[PDB]
């Protein structure tokens, strides 16, 4: 492939460099339209800018935490982090979010990796070996109330059991209801006067919910869960302007008030170098 | 070799090697030729 | 003697002529078309009023003055009240449509000024409150009036800051969306053909707008000496290939 | 039972590796795809669309005005604007090009810089745009500027001028984050003759300026952008 | 292959052993040009002197250390070794360095092995099990500030998570900007009067940066990281004189003052055996 | 699931072994090679060039 | 001995995965199947039989 | 596979929607027996409702 | 590839792709045609 | 068998078995024959 062809002096009536940008086109002008060039080859394919590659590496999408401790007398397991959850989403944390929102609709399979590490902030004789159980409670399923409810039987709901310190990995097909996931949605769930706007209304997909299977030892053990997400088989439509201001909320486009100028001011003139 | 039955479980896809910027760079209704005048 | 410059668009029972055009943009290089069976889901036969809905509606005019910040209309909202297009809209459960948008602004060879005319698929607005305040329905359904970016923040309304496109992105990059400029010195109209763009084959016309049309002054209007300091901008829009499906009782929407 | 040996690296999680995994939802059938206009395949497809450069960076809070390069009637010989070419920083940084370049470590290729004139139709002007390849200072006067890559632009019916910064380089890749060894030059613009307004007209006229990449362009070695960060996880 | 051919008495006008070294050549003289030889075969190929073999074994290129401890009240994580880094380089430690600098330009893929072991120098009830996370912050990426910054999300930057006591291994293609890496560079980054000289100016490639993912336990744990590097697919040009004096700095050729004579003095005469 | 048995040596790191590894930079394209005079392939090539001997070591 | 590398997820138990296992009862012979009317293959077969709706829910 | 065929107005002596449930059958009535439909395809096989799948986790 | 000798040890079965609701939805002795009168 | 997609991930290269010391041992412009006089 040639990156530049050889081209010499020109004295024409045919001027490729004068255009009318009002038309909305970006005319494909090249170095050889306005200087004299020599042949050179590309030596490159643009492999690593493919959208599959761009969205295809694991990104941290969520960090949560649960603890193993005596539940005796706990009136609210959920509240003691005897177990927890994450009503799923991927707007949660912002590095991957800016990448996805370069597109309007996106379609892909997900590969999740879940790393779990334990901490024992206060005096323990040892480090126990805990097994985590992460189950996905698809909306409608009967969400779970104590850390050892009938829910955890998970007879119809996919669940994975792995050890703290290890990693769990599995992959979920594209579960969207439509043909693509909306990265943006300028609508409502119905025409009510006070219903919510954006896409937190469309991105209702239950949520994964973790717990330790082990009963309690004499000390307490903090287990912190990190969920990583990798898109595989990516398809993206309609590019948009990149995010300039900071994010404030999962699912709304809102930016913070009295934010700071995002364009760097010159130290000098327009004329400055 | 796929070891698994479902398609979601296969590895990453392989390069589009599609590449056609004209839907974005030249969505004009009447075709513009480089070198010919923009507005006639 | 054909110029890129003169054009005629006849759609239904209405025709537009421009003698100072700058080509026309067809979003993503695709022209509006009906919904193919292979893509269909709802089993209902759809209704295609054709020429009674696919004609040109001219919205009320705006006034560009030296202080203007820009205006924003949403589709199909802007047309919610135009003739039979609008009736069909409130009466069917689902509908689908593409449009021809023609923005008009003429001046003289002594004026200067340049407007950006852009179509943004799925333009989800931001609340000026920050945090996770929502933007109420009425605020994103201004109707033919559209939203005036130089109007004041209101409560439950969107933010109207132009350098941020009403969503946290910079004005400068709106050029990645199908768009055309109106530069008084060149141009006097802008025309964009919009194919139907959605993640579902057909949708509700009232709970979801699928494009915002935005006209933004970028190089300020500058009139000749002792000229009146303003120009009107007119927007005329025509639904094209419209289909409605799931007819019934007639939606009632807030406000 | 087949005898195996495990190597160094067993059990590691590399966020960039690409392997098979069991599906959690065996046998599930995804929604059919329908057609949607606009599919993107390569980031190289989109960085060829031009976007506006806030060249007039001299303001103090972001404003529509930093996109406008002003021009003065009747000045002769003088300089319209100047900038270095660190596409990952400074004026370029918020543009779509700048914004994507920042996802990669290295770039190579030609850039296309165009200027669209917005002055009254009955005015006229001749400007010179000059590209100064690495090795010399930003030009200080047109004489200096005109000895490097340049285009005399004659403002006419055809409203925009497209200047190309041809890839001039020893090393075949430059770093996107500004680096010296790897630096690309300067871009300046001067009156060639001068802007002239018709009667009954007055004041400043402005140029809009765009940037996009030539088909020439290469970007490689993906990394994280300095353009976005956060202090606590967001919630709904 | 014959190592020596058979050759007998000679009384010629053709003298292969008289040459003129002023010419710059090393004339290919053999035993059989000056004594009577018998046939013998080589029995050898020179396999283990191939440059791929010479540069192809893992060498330790870096030892760093980080600790897991309560960051509460630490004003400078980087400074507490709550995490660290290494602006990469391979002049760092000298065994592999002398080997590479036998050549001027070198081109190869790298295979890294990272061994991490833990130490608990002061009273602990136990040994905790820590997961290390090593990410590569390519220059320009937004380098990381606390041990748990958004940076560590590493949504676009390759990172590996492995356990202390284990090893991590992965391989990075030749990332040089030119066609080869310069082992030497007699230049500057530009013609300034005070800019730095050598190659630390050319070998700007960011740096890898490690941390422990675990929160803190009651005791403190020292984790010491050793990075090993193996060249694979080696290509080397222009041999040079081997390094004689000791090294003082990464990237400069400088040797220490009042160094010692590097040539061993005879214990005796020139005539001595 | 195929039945396996691991042998002695599993998990060891031998600095001299030669195996495959995942690339950290999937799909990256290295700079083209250009021609450079002087390529060395074997150390046996270079030890045939003669160099001076500090024979007079007595200093 | 063939060189291997284990990936993330090794040792996990996913209740939805489908693999082979050793039989605890090697060589056992199950009872023959006889014919029984009524075999169901898909839940989609049965949701097409209509059943009564307690529409008058007001009790 | 078609999920619905195209069907238009009807004015017949052949009424598929009147039945006698006392018989014990569930007559296979479709949208196209009582409204005007357009063609649409199934795009689906019913894989995940197989009893092997239902009892197999 | 089965690694094991017994049939119980193989993975899950594969979709019936049988599907015939008529034993449940139309177990009537004399065949009913849709469109013809239910009771003659 | 390569298990990985990228070339960097393959094992060590295989012996040049190239070997030609003359660029280093005899870079003279006019060819010298062993046995013939060095300087004529
Ligand atoms: C954009 C965008 C991205 C997403 C998230 C999609 C999540 C799909 C469902 O997620 C899961 C399904 C199953 C499991 C699971 N099954 C057994 C263990 O975990 C986990 C998750 Cl996160 O939603 N919108
Ligand atoms: C000579 C010479 C040798 C070198 C060093 C080359 C280093 C290349 C880049 O290094 C890395 C890239 C990625 C990773 C990495 N990705 C995930 C984990 O580690 C690590 C390193 Cl050291 O530079 N000059």
């Amino acid at each position: 492939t040639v990156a530049s062809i050889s081209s010499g002096p020109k004295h024409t009536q045919k001027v490729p460099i004068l255009t009318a940008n009002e038309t909305g086109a970006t005319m494909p002008v090249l170095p050889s339209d306005s200087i004299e060039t020599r042949t050179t080859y590309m030596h490159f394919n643009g492999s690593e800018t493919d959208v599959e590659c761009f969205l295809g590496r694991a990104a941290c999408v969520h960090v949560t935490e649960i603890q193993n401790k005596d539940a005796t007398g706990i009136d609210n397991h959920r509240e003691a982090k005897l177990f927890n959850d994450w009503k799923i989403n991927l707007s949660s944390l912002v590095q991957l979010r800016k990448k996805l929102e370069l597109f309007t609709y996106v379609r892909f399979d997900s590969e999740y990796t879940i790393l779990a590490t334990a901490s024992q902030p206060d005096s323990a004789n040892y480090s126990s070996n805990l097994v985590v159980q992460a189950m996905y409670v698809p909306p409608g399923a009967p969400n779970p109330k104590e850390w050892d409810d009938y829910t955890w039987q998970s007879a119809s709901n996919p669940s994975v059991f792995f050890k703290v310190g290890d990693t769990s990995r599995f992959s979920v097909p594209y579960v969207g209801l439509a043909s693509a996931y909306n990265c943006f949605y300028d609508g409502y769930s119905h025409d009510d006067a006070e219903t919510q706007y954006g896409i937190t209304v469309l991105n209702h997909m239950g949520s994964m919910a973790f717990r330790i299977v082990n009963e309690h030892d004499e000390h307490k053990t903090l287990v912190k869960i990190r969920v990583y997400h990798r898109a595989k088989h990516v398809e993206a439509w309609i590019p948009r302007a990149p995010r300039a201001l900071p994010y404030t909320s999962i699912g709304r486009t809102n930016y913070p008030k009295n934010t700071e100028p995002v364009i760097k001011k010159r130290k000098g003139d327009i004329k400055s170098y | 070799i796929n070891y698994y039955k479902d398609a979601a479980s296969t590895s990453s896809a392989g390069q589009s090697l599609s590449m056609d910027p004209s839907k974005f760079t030249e969505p004009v209704k009447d075709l513009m030729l480089k070198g010919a005048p923009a507005l006639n | 003697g054909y110029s890129d410059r003169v054009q005629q668009i006849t759609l239904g029972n209405s025709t537009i002529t421009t003698q100072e055009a700058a080509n026309a943009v067809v979003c993503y290089a695709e022209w509006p078309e009906y919904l193919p069976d292979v893509d269909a889901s709802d089993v209902n036969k759809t209704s295609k009023p054709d020429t009674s809905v696919c004609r040109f509606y001219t919205l009320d005019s705006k006034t560009w003055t030296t202080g203007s910040k820009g205006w924003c209309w949403k589709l199909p909202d802007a047309l919610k009240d135009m003739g039979v297009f609008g009736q069909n809209m409130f009466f069917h459960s689902l509908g689908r449509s593409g449009y021809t948008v023609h923005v008009q602004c003429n001046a003289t060879k002594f004026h200067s000024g340049c407007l950006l005319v852009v179509v943004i698929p799925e333009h989800q607005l931001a609340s000026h409150e920050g945090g996770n305040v929502s933007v109420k329905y009425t605020f994103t359904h201004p109707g033919e009036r559209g939203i005036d970016l130089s109007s004041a923040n209101e409560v439950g309304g969107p933010v109207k800051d132009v350098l941020y496109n009403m969503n946290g992105t910079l004005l400068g990059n709106l050029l990645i969306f199908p768009h055309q400029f109106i530069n008084l010195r060149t141009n006097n109209t802008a025309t964009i053909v919009i194919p139907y763009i959605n993640s579902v084959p057909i949708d509700s016309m009232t709970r979801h707008n699928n494009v915002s049309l935005m006209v933004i002054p970028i190089a300020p209007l500058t009139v000749p000496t002792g000229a009146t300091p303003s120009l009107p901008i007119t927007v005329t829009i025509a639904p094209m290939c419209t289909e409605f499906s799931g007819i019934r009782s007639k939606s009632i929407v807030p406000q | 039972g087949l005898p195996t040996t495990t190597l160094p690296g067993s059990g590691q999680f590399l966020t960039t590796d690409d392997r098979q995994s069991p599906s959690a939802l065996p046998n599930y059938e995804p929604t059919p795809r329908i057609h949607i206009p606009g599919k993107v395949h390569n980031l190289l497809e989109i960085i060829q669309v031009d976007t506006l450069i806030p060249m007039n960076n001299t303001h103090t809070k972001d404003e529509v005005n930093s996109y406008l390069i002003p021009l003065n009637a009747n000045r002769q010989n003088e300089q319209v604007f100047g900038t270095n070419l660190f596409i990952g920083d400074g004026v370029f940084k918020t543009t779509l090009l700048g914004e994507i370049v920042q996802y990669y470590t290295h770039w190579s290729g030609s850039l296309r810089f165009s200027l669209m004139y917005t002055g009254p139709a009955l005015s006229s002007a001749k400007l010179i745009l000059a590209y100064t390849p690495p090795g010399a200072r930003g030009p200080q006067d047109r004489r200096e500027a005109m000895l490097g890559t340049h285009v005399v632009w004659d403002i006419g019916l055809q409203s925009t001028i497209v200047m190309t910064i041809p890839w001039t380089s020893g090393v075949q890749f430059r770093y996107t984050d500004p680096d010296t060894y790897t630096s690309a030059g300067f871009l300046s613009c001067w009156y060639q003759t001068s802007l002239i307004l018709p009667p009954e007209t007055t004041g400043q006229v402005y140029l809009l300026s765009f940037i996009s990449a030539c088909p020439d362009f290469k970007l490689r070695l993906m990394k994280d952008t300095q353009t976005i960060s956060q202090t606590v996880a967001l919630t709904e």
Side-chain angles (χ1 to χ4, degrees), chain C residues 90-201:
Chain C
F90 282 98
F91 274 107
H92 300 73
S93 202
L94 292 164
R96 146 201 230 278
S97 184
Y99 304 98
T100 283
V101 167
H102 182 60
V103 179
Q104 312 140 247
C105 177
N106 58 282
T108 82
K109 328 185 109 54
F110 304 78
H111 291 70
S112 355
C114 173
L115 300 173
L116 165 75
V117 171
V118 55
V119 164
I120 308 172
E122 300 287 347
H123 201 206
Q124 193 193 141
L125 292 189
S127 187
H128 59 313
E129 223 129 303
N132 64 322
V133 180
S134 125
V135 173
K136 340 261 275 212
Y137 194 97
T138 351
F139 297 107
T140 66
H141 300 76
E144 141 199 358
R145 234 196 82 120
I147 302 179
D148 175 340
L149 245 60
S150 72
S151 86
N153 278 346
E154 32 193 331
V155 167
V159 42
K160 303 145 124 121
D161 227 322
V162 218
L163 248 269
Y164 304 136
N165 305 322
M166 305 180 82
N167 61 196
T169 64
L170 271 181
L171 167 73
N173 292 340
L174 229 44
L175 266 51
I176 186 71
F177 297 106
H179 68 275
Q180 142 141 330
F181 284 95
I182 295 189
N183 181 197
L184 301 182
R185 57 141 30 235
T186 296
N187 228 2
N188 97 200
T189 55
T191 300
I192 301 179
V193 184
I194 310 164
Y196 176 68
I197 301 161
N198 201 177
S199 49
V200 301

Side-chain angles (χ1 to χ4, degrees), chain A residues 79-115:
Chain A
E79 244 189 47
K81 335 286 215 133
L82 264 202
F83 85 99
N84 211 183
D85 61 37
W86 167 43
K87 173 226 215 120
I88 328 224
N89 94 86
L90 254 125
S91 272
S92 45
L93 331 180
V94 334
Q95 269 190 345
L96 167 73
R97 185 183 168 167
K98 173 178 224 212
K99 283 212 270 173
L100 289 155
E101 307 183 346
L102 224 38
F103 310 112
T104 305
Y105 309 113
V106 102
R107 187 199 172 103
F108 52 68
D109 296 315
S110 302
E111 173 201 75
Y112 282 109
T113 305
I114 305 192
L115 163 62

Side-chain angles (χ1 to χ4, degrees), chain B residues 22-24 26-32 38-40, chain C residues 3-5 7 22-26 28-29 31 186:
Chain B
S22 9
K23 8 151 139 83
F24 313 117
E26 267 155 278
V28 299
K29 168 158 164 315
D30 321 291
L31 167 103
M32 273 179 2
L39 316 139
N40 29 11
Chain C
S3 167
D4 251 8
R5 291 271 214 33
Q7 299 219 115
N23 207 136
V25 155
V26 176
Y28 302 115
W31 199 285
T186 296

